[PDB]
Structures are given as structure tokens and as C-alpha cells.
PDB file of all heavy atoms in Angstrom:
ATOM      1  N   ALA R   1       0.812  -1.198  -0.005  1.00 37.36           N
ATOM      2  CA  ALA R   1      -0.014   0.012   0.007  1.00 37.36           C
ATOM      3  C   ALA R   1       0.867   1.252   0.005  1.00 37.36           C
ATOM      4  O   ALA R   1       0.586   2.215  -0.724  1.00 37.36           O
ATOM      5  CB  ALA R   1      -0.918  -0.024   1.187  1.00 37.36           C
ATOM      6  N   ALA R   2       1.923   1.263   0.810  1.00 41.94           N
ATOM      7  CA  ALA R   2       2.781   2.437   0.868  1.00 41.94           C
ATOM      8  C   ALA R   2       3.489   2.653  -0.472  1.00 41.94           C
ATOM      9  O   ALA R   2       3.643   3.781  -0.922  1.00 41.94           O
ATOM     10  CB  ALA R   2       3.816   2.257   1.970  1.00 41.94           C
ATOM     11  N   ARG R   3       3.959   1.583  -1.111  1.00 42.38           N
ATOM     12  CA  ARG R   3       4.656   1.699  -2.379  1.00 42.38           C
ATOM     13  C   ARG R   3       3.762   2.327  -3.462  1.00 42.38           C
ATOM     14  O   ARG R   3       4.200   3.115  -4.276  1.00 42.38           O
ATOM     15  CB  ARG R   3       5.193   0.360  -2.840  1.00 42.38           C
ATOM     16  CG  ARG R   3       6.158  -0.291  -1.863  1.00 42.38           C
ATOM     17  CD  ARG R   3       7.542  -0.390  -2.447  1.00 42.38           C
ATOM     18  NE  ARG R   3       8.456  -1.171  -1.597  1.00 42.38           N
ATOM     19  CZ  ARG R   3       8.469  -2.475  -1.553  1.00 42.38           C
ATOM     20  NH1 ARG R   3       7.671  -3.227  -2.267  1.00 42.38           N
ATOM     21  NH2 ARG R   3       9.370  -3.077  -0.752  1.00 42.38           N
ATOM     22  N   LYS R   4       2.462   1.968  -3.454  1.00 40.31           N
ATOM     23  CA  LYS R   4       1.558   2.536  -4.407  1.00 40.31           C
ATOM     24  C   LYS R   4       1.186   3.972  -4.087  1.00 40.31           C
ATOM     25  O   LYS R   4       0.940   4.777  -5.016  1.00 40.31           O
ATOM     26  CB  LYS R   4       0.283   1.682  -4.495  1.00 40.31           C
ATOM     27  CG  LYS R   4       0.489   0.285  -5.017  1.00 40.31           C
ATOM     28  CD  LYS R   4      -0.791  -0.501  -5.129  1.00 40.31           C
ATOM     29  CE  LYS R   4      -0.571  -1.917  -5.581  1.00 40.31           C
ATOM     30  NZ  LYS R   4      -0.108  -1.971  -7.011  1.00 40.31           N
ATOM     31  N   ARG R   5       1.174   4.348  -2.828  1.00 37.80           N
ATOM     32  CA  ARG R   5       0.762   5.673  -2.436  1.00 37.80           C
ATOM     33  C   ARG R   5       1.695   6.708  -3.033  1.00 37.80           C
ATOM     34  O   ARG R   5       2.917   6.554  -2.997  1.00 37.80           O
ATOM     35  CB  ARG R   5       0.749   5.794  -0.902  1.00 37.80           C
ATOM     36  CG  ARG R   5       0.098   7.027  -0.369  1.00 37.80           C
ATOM     37  CD  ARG R   5       0.269   7.146   1.135  1.00 37.80           C
ATOM     38  NE  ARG R   5      -0.865   6.613   1.865  1.00 37.80           N
ATOM     39  CZ  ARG R   5      -1.925   7.288   2.272  1.00 37.80           C
ATOM     40  NH1 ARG R   5      -2.057   8.594   1.981  1.00 37.80           N
ATOM     41  NH2 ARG R   5      -2.882   6.675   2.923  1.00 37.80           N
ATOM     42  N   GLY R   6       1.129   7.791  -3.585  1.00 39.30           N
ATOM     43  CA  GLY R   6       1.902   8.751  -4.306  1.00 39.30           C
ATOM     44  C   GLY R   6       2.293  10.005  -3.505  1.00 39.30           C
ATOM     45  O   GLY R   6       1.824  11.123  -3.838  1.00 39.30           O
ATOM     46  N   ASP R   7       3.076   9.835  -2.469  1.00 36.93           N
ATOM     47  CA  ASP R   7       3.645  10.965  -1.737  1.00 36.93           C
ATOM     48  C   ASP R   7       5.090  11.209  -2.185  1.00 36.93           C
ATOM     49  O   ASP R   7       5.558  10.579  -3.148  1.00 36.93           O
ATOM     50  CB  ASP R   7       3.567  10.743  -0.241  1.00 36.93           C
ATOM     51  CG  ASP R   7       2.115  10.607   0.258  1.00 36.93           C
ATOM     52  OD1 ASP R   7       1.220  10.428  -0.598  1.00 36.93           O
ATOM     53  OD2 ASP R   7       1.890  10.647   1.492  1.00 36.93           O
ATOM     54  N   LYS R   8       5.799  12.090  -1.502  1.00 33.84           N
ATOM     55  CA  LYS R   8       7.127  12.472  -1.919  1.00 33.84           C
ATOM     56  C   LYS R   8       8.178  11.436  -1.542  1.00 33.84           C
ATOM     57  O   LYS R   8       8.823  10.847  -2.414  1.00 33.84           O
ATOM     58  CB  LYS R   8       7.489  13.849  -1.330  1.00 33.84           C
ATOM     59  CG  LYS R   8       6.875  15.008  -2.091  1.00 33.84           C
ATOM     60  CD  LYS R   8       7.550  15.236  -3.413  1.00 33.84           C
ATOM     61  CE  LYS R   8       7.201  16.598  -4.002  1.00 33.84           C
ATOM     62  NZ  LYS R   8       7.597  17.717  -3.153  1.00 33.84           N
ATOM     63  N   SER R   9       8.355  11.209  -0.242  1.00 28.95           N
ATOM     64  CA  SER R   9       9.353  10.258   0.225  1.00 28.95           C
ATOM     65  C   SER R   9       8.683   8.982   0.715  1.00 28.95           C
ATOM     66  O   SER R   9       7.516   8.933   1.073  1.00 28.95           O
ATOM     67  CB  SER R   9      10.124  10.894   1.426  1.00 28.95           C
ATOM     68  OG  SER R   9      11.062   9.976   1.943  1.00 28.95           O
ATOM     69  N   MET R  10       9.479   7.911   0.680  1.00 29.18           N
ATOM     70  CA  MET R  10       8.972   6.633   1.148  1.00 29.18           C
ATOM     71  C   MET R  10       8.558   6.688   2.620  1.00 29.18           C
ATOM     72  O   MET R  10       7.529   6.136   3.002  1.00 29.18           O
ATOM     73  CB  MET R  10      10.015   5.498   0.955  1.00 29.18           C
ATOM     74  CG  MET R  10       9.463   4.100   1.037  1.00 29.18           C
ATOM     75  SD  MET R  10       7.885   3.837   0.251  1.00 29.18           S
ATOM     76  CE  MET R  10       7.417   2.219   0.909  1.00 29.18           C
ATOM     77  N   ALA R  11       9.405   7.313   3.454  1.00 27.07           N
ATOM     78  CA  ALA R  11       9.049   7.475   4.847  1.00 27.07           C
ATOM     79  C   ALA R  11       7.721   8.210   5.033  1.00 27.07           C
ATOM     80  O   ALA R  11       6.900   7.769   5.838  1.00 27.07           O
ATOM     81  CB  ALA R  11      10.182   8.197   5.611  1.00 27.07           C
ATOM     82  N   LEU R  12       7.501   9.243   4.244  1.00 28.39           N
ATOM     83  CA  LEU R  12       6.207   9.910   4.275  1.00 28.39           C
ATOM     84  C   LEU R  12       5.095   9.035   3.809  1.00 28.39           C
ATOM     85  O   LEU R  12       4.020   8.982   4.412  1.00 28.39           O
ATOM     86  CB  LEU R  12       6.264  11.191   3.435  1.00 28.39           C
ATOM     87  CG  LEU R  12       4.995  12.049   3.435  1.00 28.39           C
ATOM     88  CD1 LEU R  12       4.636  12.465   4.865  1.00 28.39           C
ATOM     89  CD2 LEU R  12       5.184  13.264   2.542  1.00 28.39           C
ATOM     90  N   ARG R  13       5.317   8.283   2.724  1.00 26.90           N
ATOM     91  CA  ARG R  13       4.337   7.321   2.257  1.00 26.90           C
ATOM     92  C   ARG R  13       4.014   6.312   3.329  1.00 26.90           C
ATOM     93  O   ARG R  13       2.835   6.064   3.634  1.00 26.90           O
ATOM     94  CB  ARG R  13       4.829   6.613   1.012  1.00 26.90           C
ATOM     95  CG  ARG R  13       4.832   7.415  -0.252  1.00 26.90           C
ATOM     96  CD  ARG R  13       5.375   6.651  -1.427  1.00 26.90           C
ATOM     97  NE  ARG R  13       5.425   7.438  -2.652  1.00 26.90           N
ATOM     98  CZ  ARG R  13       5.808   6.976  -3.830  1.00 26.90           C
ATOM     99  NH1 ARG R  13       6.170   5.725  -3.989  1.00 26.90           N
ATOM    100  NH2 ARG R  13       5.788   7.802  -4.887  1.00 26.90           N
ATOM    101  N   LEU R  14       5.034   5.741   3.961  1.00 23.91           N
ATOM    102  CA  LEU R  14       4.822   4.717   4.964  1.00 23.91           C
ATOM    103  C   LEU R  14       4.109   5.287   6.184  1.00 23.91           C
ATOM    104  O   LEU R  14       3.180   4.682   6.714  1.00 23.91           O
ATOM    105  CB  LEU R  14       6.152   4.072   5.385  1.00 23.91           C
ATOM    106  CG  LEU R  14       6.057   2.953   6.417  1.00 23.91           C
ATOM    107  CD1 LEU R  14       5.338   1.764   5.806  1.00 23.91           C
ATOM    108  CD2 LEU R  14       7.478   2.572   6.859  1.00 23.91           C
ATOM    109  N   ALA R  15       4.494   6.504   6.619  1.00 24.09           N
ATOM    110  CA  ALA R  15       3.843   7.127   7.753  1.00 24.09           C
ATOM    111  C   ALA R  15       2.347   7.354   7.518  1.00 24.09           C
ATOM    112  O   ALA R  15       1.549   7.075   8.367  1.00 24.09           O
ATOM    113  CB  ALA R  15       4.552   8.423   8.121  1.00 24.09           C
ATOM    114  N   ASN R  16       2.022   7.866   6.348  1.00 23.19           N
ATOM    115  CA  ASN R  16       0.630   8.096   6.011  1.00 23.19           C
ATOM    116  C   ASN R  16      -0.150   6.791   5.958  1.00 23.19           C
ATOM    117  O   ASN R  16      -1.268   6.700   6.458  1.00 23.19           O
ATOM    118  CB  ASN R  16       0.522   8.841   4.694  1.00 23.19           C
ATOM    119  CG  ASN R  16       1.030  10.260   4.773  1.00 23.19           C
ATOM    120  OD1 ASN R  16       1.312  10.790   5.849  1.00 23.19           O
ATOM    121  ND2 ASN R  16       1.179  10.877   3.617  1.00 23.19           N
ATOM    122  N   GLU R  17       0.445   5.757   5.342  1.00 23.46           N
ATOM    123  CA  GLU R  17      -0.272   4.512   5.110  1.00 23.46           C
ATOM    124  C   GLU R  17      -0.671   3.880   6.429  1.00 23.46           C
ATOM    125  O   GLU R  17      -1.861   3.531   6.626  1.00 23.46           O
ATOM    126  CB  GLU R  17       0.573   3.554   4.299  1.00 23.46           C
ATOM    127  CG  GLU R  17      -0.095   2.227   4.058  1.00 23.46           C
ATOM    128  CD  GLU R  17      -1.501   2.329   3.513  1.00 23.46           C
ATOM    129  OE1 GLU R  17      -1.750   3.193   2.661  1.00 23.46           O
ATOM    130  OE2 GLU R  17      -2.389   1.574   4.002  1.00 23.46           O
ATOM    131  N   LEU R  18       0.250   3.656   7.338  1.00 24.94           N
ATOM    132  CA  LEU R  18      -0.036   3.021   8.604  1.00 24.94           C
ATOM    133  C   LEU R  18      -0.692   3.971   9.602  1.00 24.94           C
ATOM    134  O   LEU R  18      -1.207   3.526  10.611  1.00 24.94           O
ATOM    135  CB  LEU R  18       1.232   2.418   9.213  1.00 24.94           C
ATOM    136  CG  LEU R  18       2.453   3.308   9.444  1.00 24.94           C
ATOM    137  CD1 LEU R  18       2.373   3.918  10.818  1.00 24.94           C
ATOM    138  CD2 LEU R  18       3.733   2.526   9.250  1.00 24.94           C
ATOM    139  N   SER R  19      -0.658   5.270   9.307  1.00 24.28           N
ATOM    140  CA  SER R  19      -1.497   6.190  10.082  1.00 24.28           C
ATOM    141  C   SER R  19      -2.979   6.019   9.731  1.00 24.28           C
ATOM    142  O   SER R  19      -3.823   5.961  10.606  1.00 24.28           O
ATOM    143  CB  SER R  19      -1.055   7.646   9.821  1.00 24.28           C
ATOM    144  OG  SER R  19      -2.010   8.567  10.318  1.00 24.28           O
ATOM    145  N   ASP R  20      -3.286   5.897   8.416  1.00 25.81           N
ATOM    146  CA  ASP R  20      -4.636   5.566   8.026  1.00 25.81           C
ATOM    147  C   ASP R  20      -5.042   4.203   8.546  1.00 25.81           C
ATOM    148  O   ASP R  20      -6.211   4.027   8.922  1.00 25.81           O
ATOM    149  CB  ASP R  20      -4.741   5.601   6.491  1.00 25.81           C
ATOM    150  CG  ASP R  20      -4.538   6.990   5.906  1.00 25.81           C
ATOM    151  OD1 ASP R  20      -4.145   7.871   6.681  1.00 25.81           O
ATOM    152  OD2 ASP R  20      -4.806   7.174   4.736  1.00 25.81           O
ATOM    153  N   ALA R  21      -4.102   3.239   8.585  1.00 26.40           N
ATOM    154  CA  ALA R  21      -4.428   1.932   9.131  1.00 26.40           C
ATOM    155  C   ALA R  21      -4.823   2.057  10.586  1.00 26.40           C
ATOM    156  O   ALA R  21      -5.773   1.354  11.034  1.00 26.40           O
ATOM    157  CB  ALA R  21      -3.201   1.006   9.004  1.00 26.40           C
ATOM    158  N   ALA R  22      -4.167   2.916  11.372  1.00 24.08           N
ATOM    159  CA  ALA R  22      -4.595   3.092  12.752  1.00 24.08           C
ATOM    160  C   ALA R  22      -6.026   3.511  12.848  1.00 24.08           C
ATOM    161  O   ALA R  22      -6.774   3.070  13.727  1.00 24.08           O
ATOM    162  CB  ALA R  22      -3.670   4.145  13.429  1.00 24.08           C
ATOM    163  N   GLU R  23      -6.507   4.356  11.915  1.00 24.45           N
ATOM    164  CA  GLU R  23      -7.899   4.745  11.788  1.00 24.45           C
ATOM    165  C   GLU R  23      -8.639   3.856  10.810  1.00 24.45           C
ATOM    166  O   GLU R  23      -9.703   4.245  10.330  1.00 24.45           O
ATOM    167  CB  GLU R  23      -8.049   6.201  11.405  1.00 24.45           C
ATOM    168  CG  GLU R  23      -7.773   7.213  12.491  1.00 24.45           C
ATOM    169  CD  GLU R  23      -6.348   7.725  12.461  1.00 24.45           C
ATOM    170  OE1 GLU R  23      -5.672   7.521  11.445  1.00 24.45           O
ATOM    171  OE2 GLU R  23      -5.898   8.336  13.465  1.00 24.45           O
ATOM    172  N   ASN R  24      -8.065   2.709  10.448  1.00 24.71           N
ATOM    173  CA  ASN R  24      -8.667   1.670   9.608  1.00 24.71           C
ATOM    174  C   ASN R  24      -9.468   2.287   8.420  1.00 24.71           C
ATOM    175  O   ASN R  24     -10.680   2.055   8.305  1.00 24.71           O
ATOM    176  CB  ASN R  24      -9.537   0.713  10.417  1.00 24.71           C
ATOM    177  CG  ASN R  24     -10.816   1.319  10.913  1.00 24.71           C
ATOM    178  OD1 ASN R  24     -10.881   2.487  11.329  1.00 24.71           O
ATOM    179  ND2 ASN R  24     -11.909   0.552  10.844  1.00 24.71           N
ATOM    180  N   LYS R  25      -8.766   3.043   7.575  1.00 26.45           N
ATOM    181  CA  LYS R  25      -9.375   3.444   6.313  1.00 26.45           C
ATOM    182  C   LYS R  25      -8.412   3.394   5.136  1.00 26.45           C
ATOM    183  O   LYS R  25      -8.787   3.845   4.030  1.00 26.45           O
ATOM    184  CB  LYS R  25      -9.894   4.903   6.414  1.00 26.45           C
ATOM    185  CG  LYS R  25      -8.828   5.966   6.589  1.00 26.45           C
ATOM    186  CD  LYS R  25      -9.411   7.377   6.618  1.00 26.45           C
ATOM    187  CE  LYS R  25     -10.161   7.669   7.903  1.00 26.45           C
ATOM    188  NZ  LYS R  25      -9.240   7.697   9.083  1.00 26.45           N
TER     189      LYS R  25
END
């Protein structure tokens, strides 16, 4: 999911992805 997400940096992608996971969306 993070790899597909289109943010700037991988760390930013990963942080957003599992942040949404915390709120399960």
C-alpha cells in the first residue's frame, strides 16, 4: 500500500499509510 501511495518520500508514504491503518481506512 505504501509503495503505491503517491507521496514524496517513502518514509512519508509509509507514515501516512499506517497512520490511516490506525484509523482503519
Side-chain angles (χ1 to χ4, degrees):
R3 300 247 188 77
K4 293 182 183 293
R5 193 187 265 268
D7 297 14
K8 280 288 194 61
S9 177
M10 195 42 193
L12 182 58
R13 285 178 183 185
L14 183 66
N16 293 348
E17 177 50 43
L18 56 90
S19 168
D20 294 11
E23 285 95 15
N24 73 319
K25 66 178 72 66

